[PDB]
Amino acid sequence: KLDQALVVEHIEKMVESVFRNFDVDGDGHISQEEFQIIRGNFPYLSAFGDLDQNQDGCISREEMVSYFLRSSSVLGGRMGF
């Protein structure tokens, strides 16, 4: 069986889930305060400097999307940690 459709919908919904997850204030960008308190319960995320190259303290679509294709391996993006 192919997971093409499975992960296609999961990926698209993933970027949309994170984009809206950290943007509950409807600002269009991830404010430092949002990631500030959220990181306190979600240490599984990288640092601002890694998510945003410009270090604007704000995460855009290109940052999350590029991050999905950035940390993307053969099909997904897992190593074993």
Swiss-Prot record:
Detected in platelets, neutrophils and T lymphocytes (at protein level). Expressed in brain where it is enriched in the striatum. Also expressed in the hematopoietic system. Detected in heart, brain, lung, placenta, liver, skeletal muscle and kidney. It is found in: Cytoplasm, Cytosol; Cell membrane; Synapse, Synaptosome; Cell projection, Ruffle membrane. Signal peptide: none annotated. The N-terminal Ras-GEF domain mediates association with F-actin. It is linked to Bleeding disorder, platelet-type, 18: A disorder characterized by increased bleeding tendency due to platelet dysfunction. Clinical features include epistaxis, hematomas, bleeding after tooth extraction, and menorrhagia. Belongs to the RASGRP family. This is RAS guanyl-releasing protein 2. The gene is RASGRP2.
